[PDB]
Amino acid sequence: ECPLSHDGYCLHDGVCMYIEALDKYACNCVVGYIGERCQYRDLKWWE
Amino acid sequence: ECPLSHDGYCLHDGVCMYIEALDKYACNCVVGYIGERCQYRDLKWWE
Amino acid sequence: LEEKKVCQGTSNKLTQLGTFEDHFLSLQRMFNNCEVVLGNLEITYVQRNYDLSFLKTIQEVAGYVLIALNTVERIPLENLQIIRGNMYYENSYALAVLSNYDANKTGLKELPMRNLQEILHGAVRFSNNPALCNVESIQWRDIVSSDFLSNMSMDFQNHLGSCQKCDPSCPNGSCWGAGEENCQKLTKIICAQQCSGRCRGKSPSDCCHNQCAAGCTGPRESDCLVCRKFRNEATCKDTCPPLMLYNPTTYQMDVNPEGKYSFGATCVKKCPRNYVVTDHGSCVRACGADSYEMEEDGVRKCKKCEGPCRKVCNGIGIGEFKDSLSINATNIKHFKNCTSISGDLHILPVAFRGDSFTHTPPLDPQELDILKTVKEITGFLLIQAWPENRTDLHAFENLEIIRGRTKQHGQFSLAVVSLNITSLGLRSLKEISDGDVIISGNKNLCYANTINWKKLFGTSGQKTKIISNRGENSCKATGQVCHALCSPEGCWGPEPRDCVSCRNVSRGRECVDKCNLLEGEPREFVENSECIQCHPECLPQAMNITCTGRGPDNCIQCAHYIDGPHCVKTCPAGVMGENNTLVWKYADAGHVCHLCHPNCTYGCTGPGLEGCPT
Amino acid sequence: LEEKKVCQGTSNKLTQLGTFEDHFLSLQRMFNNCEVVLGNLEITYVQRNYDLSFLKTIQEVAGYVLIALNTVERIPLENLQIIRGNMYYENSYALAVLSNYDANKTGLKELPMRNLQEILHGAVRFSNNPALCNVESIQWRDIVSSDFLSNMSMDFQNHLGSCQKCDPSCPNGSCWGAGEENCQKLTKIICAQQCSGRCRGKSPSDCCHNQCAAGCTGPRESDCLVCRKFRNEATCKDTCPPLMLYNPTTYQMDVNPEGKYSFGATCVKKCPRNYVVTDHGSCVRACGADSYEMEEDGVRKCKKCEGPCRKVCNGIGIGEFKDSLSINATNIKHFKNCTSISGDLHILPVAFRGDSFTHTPPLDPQELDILKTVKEITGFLLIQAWPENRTDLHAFENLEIIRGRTKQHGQFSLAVVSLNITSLGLRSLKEISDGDVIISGNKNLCYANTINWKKLFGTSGQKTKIISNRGENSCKATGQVCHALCSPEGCWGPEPRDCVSCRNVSRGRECVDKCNLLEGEPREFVENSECIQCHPECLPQAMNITCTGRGPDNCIQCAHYIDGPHCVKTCPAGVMGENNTLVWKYADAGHVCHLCHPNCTYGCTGPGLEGCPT
Known part of the structure; x- marks a missing residue:
């Protein structure tokens, strides 16, 4: 979806999207990970 | 004038007097000596 | 009950945490029952019939407030009083409401933040939400600061026009929603001519203290609604009262x-x-x-310092490190000899893979030895990737304390998760001052449940979440229990070296049962259960005590010349004093070194004045 | 703006200095061209037909204002604006006007304090001045703060009747001096409740900032007349802005x-x-x-000392010593081992006779040797009395610095006047930081001008005043000019012991004609005109110099052996090294020190094993 300038953007098996309206890019973090690039791990709610 | 309860009160040859109105005693410092009881020498004007 | 509950606030701007149901759950777990967001309030991807009624409690946001990509009908932020705006979305907004609609143009319709009265910083932005009405009637020069009226950006093109009228019982046709309660209450552009900040009415005898932030109730510093600066237990000071x-x-x-x-x-x-x-x-x-x-x-x-002042480098994030988000192979060098981290450590899987979106090359797993010197962490240590070759946290064996100034998710200070290491290896960790300990999700890691973590906790209320590591009844059946000689407190690894405390004796770092007092070459002497070898001058007797104190003032017989309690290997040869009596010594009958005489001017290479020729 | 001409302000409290003519001259001397009295203002014994056309510039009194026992009819305290009232007369008041009548009831009549508005502390007293009308009209609720309106005592009685009524262009019967220029201006009891401090009008739009004492010109804090607490070079802050x-x-x-x-x-x-x-x-x-x-x-x-640090004792004039005139016999005990004096020194002839007023017995002369410990002083030194038996200032032979912080009459740090002393004896004096010195009136002293105090005054503007001492021609011609060979620009005694400026050189505490370069018993070198001995290990050079420093590193040739950069007496043979390994060396051809073979434990007399048999 998002061009190869933003490849490997979303860490931890991310699904990088393209926001149509705001004309920006974003991530689709797999469950359990938070952050703008899905970098961290949601420690409070699992291992 | 001042009763001998206040003898030698005025240093450097003071002339202790009695203010009639205020009912208080005070000195009559020789020239060149200042202070409440003629203690200090007026250094700012002479030797 | 004045300790009003606080949140941490998300910081993932436009990302979606899973699906629409998983993201909405992550939104609920965060902001359910809290009144003071300490970070940001972001509300994205919330579809229809999801009730956001849990938001009606929020009363203050210490950062921006983003409201985007929703399709819900109403976002009831009807108790929000102020947005301190300590952090801007797109560098200039402390409230941004962008594109709340799907591809049929039925999106947000009711944003009834009737109580929003002050935005201490930043502009406001609205865009592309073509079902939001009854908000273009808000005059935003009473809310937004007097400075930031040049960065604002508002357009309400509700071409559909499918909502009620604005009650004439509030001035300037201004209202937030429908009804009478949901309309604008002004406190900045209706003040008297002499008012300093904001007011409570129109008369000249109502202005509030110039520290009240969102209007007041009385003309004092102790009756504001929000304190635009420091708060002192009842009031709102400008600075805290000096000592x-x-x-x-x-x-x-x-x-x-x-x-x-x-x-x-x-x-x-x-x-x-x-x-x-x-x-x-x-x-x-x-x-x-x-x-x-x-x-x-x-x-x-x-204090000032101990002369030459030791190295203290900046942690990840804090300082010149906000750009990068882990210890990549571009900021590892700046940790060369730093013995104390001002900040916090972030070891993340992207550090080894090598991020291309930031261009930093992969980190060679041998460059982690640079971390061998660290002795203290002021914030938190977050470990999520370690080279599978290594078998314990070798780069942190000298780690001695984790303070816990900053924390991860505002709760955790030690975070070892999802590793393949076998034992911890933090042999010198003595104290975790503040935070919680999350050690979980490691396939094959024993020895983590033996340690008494309550002994490393500087305060009370801390707790450890140590779960889902290698099973308990699987280290017994492999030989992965530590040394029998280490005390029952605990152990980090399998060696007798990496234990918490020894049972009988210690020698440096190792734990031993009976050390070398009566046998061996290092004939030691016990002291605080740490037996050390004393003054190196006095050989071992047959089996008796070899030495009892550190110096020579305690050994029974000294293997060389015995100057009473002042044993040395040789005899003194010219000790100095006043008038310079060049007194030398020699080996008398009883092997005691006796004082020389100035008669034999050649010193004393022989005994006395009868055996002192050339 | 310009700094307001300050005057120190008298403190005599009803004491007459000299004759009626001369007491007035003293007043004319202290309060002439003064605009800010840093202390108190006392106008006593001014007799009839004596003018006071110099009191029309005092704009602010920092202490109290005492006007008593006058006989002149017009005391024109015109531009007085505020009486900060730091000190008090009778421990209550900050403005007293007492018993101003002459013999035939014709005392003070016109006291036109029209510009006075504020008294920051203290009450007011008017008493037994029977010829004082035109001040009964003033209202003492605007002037004195509400705190002291109970301590205030007022009494007005002009039995004569020649009291002119005043211009009706101002407040109900409120005039200072009969006329329109000299009637009261109310600025506290006329304004609405919405003001807190002063208020230059009845409109809530012309209110004064609370950091203004008398009155304001505008609405800001930079618009006051006089500042209440502090003064940040343009405006009246409340506390100086933090660093x-x-x-x-x-x-x-x-x-x-x-x-x-x-x-x-x-x-x-x-x-x-x-x-x-x-x-x-x-x-x-x-x-x-x-x-x-x-x-x-x-x-x-x-900084913070390391436990028992140099004992400092608060000198005269501070706290524990404010009732004391000089160092009495009683209070001399507490000066036992004081190293520095945070204060100043009053040496008064009452401290040698012993007055019965303070119940103090006479002090003994030899007690003054207790002062042999002090080394500097913070304020001034005031020497007026000294036992005639002693020929020099002996108790002060350790003093090297005079800070001059709280100086005397605001001018003098050193003051040595009218003594039977023959020698100053200041072999330790090194600097006088601030203030001025008056060495005048002493019977002999002699050596006093040949000192060049200009080299002792760290700050600028400091001046000396050396007159009325035994002239040199009458003392230099009597075998008293100081010693030679010691750079005669300075001598605090006849012998060469002192000699400020040490010839071209000095041997510690003594001046000399030349350092021991080339010859002499101890070899020396020259830096800052001081002679320091070479390291014992530098060889006596009969040709050129011997060394260029204190350490053995600067020798031209060592006396014995040479262990690298340093000149040693005997090559090391037991010095601690790295890894707890001892150190043994040997002297080769050029007496150079090289290390032993690692093996050689008992040292070695040669390189390697071919040097140590065992």
């Missing part, structure tokens, strides 16, 4: 009875313990370069 | 471009050299009890 008041008459300072320490946006009478009490009477995280931790009677002040 | 601000977001202090050091009752950019700079920015006269002075950084900060 000492300089007396302009006697030219000497004297203590203030109401002086208080300034800890964040609050004036507290005593700093939290893991907080550097500074000279100006204010709790700090880490004082300047020319300083160091002078722990003194409990308070962790910092 | 560093603490932001509640990043939890650490931050430099402030508005911060000012709070010196006196003003805020300055930096403080004078002789003051103790604190970290807050305060500039104190004497740092805390636990602390002790620092030496450098360009300033005189105070």
Whole structure:
């Protein structure tokens, strides 16, 4: 979806999207990970 | 004038007097000596 | 109950945490039952029929407020009073409401934040939400600061026009929603001509203290609604009352009875313990370069320094490190000999893979030895990737304390998760001052449940979440229990070296049962259960005690010349004093070195004055 | 703006200095061309037909204002605006007017204090001045704060009747001097409740800032007439702006471009050299009890000593000693082992006779040797009395610095006047920081002009006054001019012991004609005109010089052996090294020291094993 300038953007098996309206890019973090690039791990709610 | 309860009160040859109105005693410092009881020498004007 | 509940606030701007149901759950777990968001309030991807009624409690947001990509009908932020705007979305907005619609143009319709009265910083932005109405009627020069009226950006093109009228019982056709309660209540553009900040009515005798932030109730500093600066236990000061008041008459300072320490946006009478009490009477995280931790009677002040001032480098994020988000192979060098991290550590899987979106090359797993010198962490240590070749946290064997100034998710200070290491290897960790410990999700890691973590906790209320590691009844059946000689407190690894405390004796780091007092070459002497070898001059008797004290003043017989209790290997040969009596010694009958005489001018290479020829 | 001409202000309290003619001359001397009385203003015994056309510039009195026993009819305290009332007369009042009548009831009549508005502290007293009308009209609720309206005592009685009624262009019967220029201006009891401080009108739009004492010109704090607490060179702050601000977001202090050091009752950019700079920015006269002075950084900060530190005792005129005139026989005990004096020294002839008023018995002469411990002093030195038996100032032979912080009459640090002393005896004096010196009136003293105090005055503007001593021609012609061979530009005694400026050189505490270069018994070198001995290990050079420094590193040739850069007496043979390994060396051809073979434990007399048999 998002061009190869933003490849490997979303860490931890991310699904990088393209926001149509705001004309920006974003991530689709797999469950359990938070952050703008899905970098961290949601420690409070699992291992 | 001042009763001998206040003898030698005025240093450097003071002339202790009695203010009639205020009912208080005070000195009559020789020239060149200042202070409440003629203690200090007026250094700012002479030797 | 004045300790109103707080949140941490998300910081993932436009990302989606899973699906629409998983993202909405992550939104609920965060902001359910809390009144003061300490970070940001982001509301994205919330579809229809999801009830956001849990938001009606929020009363303050210390950062921006983003409301985007929703398709819900109403976002009931009807108790929000202020948005401090300590952090801007797109560099200039403390409230941004963009594109709440799907591809049929039925999106947000009711944003009834009737109580929003002040935005201490930043502009406001609205865009592309073509079902939001009854908000273009809000006159935003009463809310947004007097400075930031040049960065604002608002357009309400509700071409559909499918909502009610605005009640004429509020001035200037201004309202937030429908009804009478949901309309604008003004406190800044209806004031008297003399008012300093904001007011409560129109008459000249109503202006509020110039520290009240979102309007007040009375004309004092102690009756504001929100304090636009420090708060002092009832009031809203500009600065916390200083501890000492300089007396302009006697030219000497004297203590203030109401002086208080300034800890964040609050004036507290005593700093939290893991907080550097500074000279100006204010709790700090880490004082300047020319300083160091002078722990003194409990308070962790910092003096000038111990001359040459040891290395203290900046942690990840804090300082010149906000760009990068882990220890990549571009900022590892700056940790060369740093013995104390001012900040916090982030070891993340992207550090080894090598990020292309930031261009930093992969980190070679041998460059982690640079971390061998660290001795203290002020914030938190987050470990999520370690080279599978290595078998324990070798780069942190010298780690000695984790303070816990900053924390991960505002709760955790030690975070070892999802590794393949076998034992911890933090052999020198003595104290985790503040935070929680998350050690979980490691396939094959034993020895983590033996340690008594309550012994490393500087405060009370901390707890460890140690779960889902290698099974308990699987280290027994492999030989992965530590040394029988280490005390029942615990052990980090399998060796007798990496234990918490020894049972009988210690030798450096190792734990041993019976050390070398009566046998062996290092004939030691026991002292605080750590037997050490003493003055190297006195050989072992047959089996008796070889030595009892550190120096020569305690050994029974010295293997060389015995000068009474002052044993040395040789005889003195010219000790110095007044008038310079060049007195030498020699080996008399009883092997005692006796004083020389000035008669034999050639010193004393022989005994006395009868055996001192050339 | 320009600094207002200050005058020190008398403190005599009803004491007459000299004759009626001369007492007035003293008043004419102290309060002439003065606009800010730093102390008290006392106008006593001014007799009829004596003018007071110089009191029409006093704009502010920092202490009290005493007007008593006068006989003149018009005391024109015209531009007096505020009486800060720091001190009090009768421990109650800050403006007293008492018993101003002459013999035939014709005393003070016109006291036109029209510009007076404020009295920051204390009550007011008017008494037994029977010829005083035109002040009964004033209302003492505008003037004195509401706190002291109970202590106030007023009495007015003009039995004569020649009291002119005053112009009706102002407040109901309220006039200072009969006319329209000299009637009262109310600025506290006329304004609505919405004001707190002063108020220049009845409209809530012309209110004065609370940091204004008499009255304002506009609505700001930079629009006051006189400042209430401090003065930041343009405006009336309440506390000087802090040097560093603490932001509640990043939890650490931050430099402030508005911060000012709070010196006196003003805020300055930096403080004078002789003051103790604190970290807050305060500039104190004497740092805390636990602390002790620092030496450098360009300033005189105070560090915290290492336990028992140099005992300092508060000198005369501070706290525990304010009832005491000089160092009595009683109070001399507390000066036992004081190393420095935070204060100043009054040596008064009452401390040798012993007055019965203070119940103090006479002091004994030999007690003055207790002062042989002190080494510097902070304020001034005031020497007026001294036992005729002694020929020099012996108790002061250790003093090297005179800070001159709280000087005498605001001018004099050193004051040696009218003594039977023959020698000053200042073999230790090295600098006089601030103030002025008056060496005048002494019977002999002789050596006093050949000192060149210009080299002892650290600050500028300091001047000496040396007159009325035994002239040189009458003392130099009587075998008393100081010793030769010692750079005669300086001598505090006949012998060469002192000699300020040591010839071209000096041997410690004594001056000499030349250093022991080339010849002599001890070899020496020259730096800053001082002769320091070479290291014993430099060879006596009969040709050129011997060394270029103290250490054995600067020798031209060693006396024995040479262990590298240093000149040693005997090559090391048991010195501690790395890894607990001892150190043994040997002397080769050029007496150079090289290490032994690692093996050789008993040392070695040659290279390697071919040097040590065992």
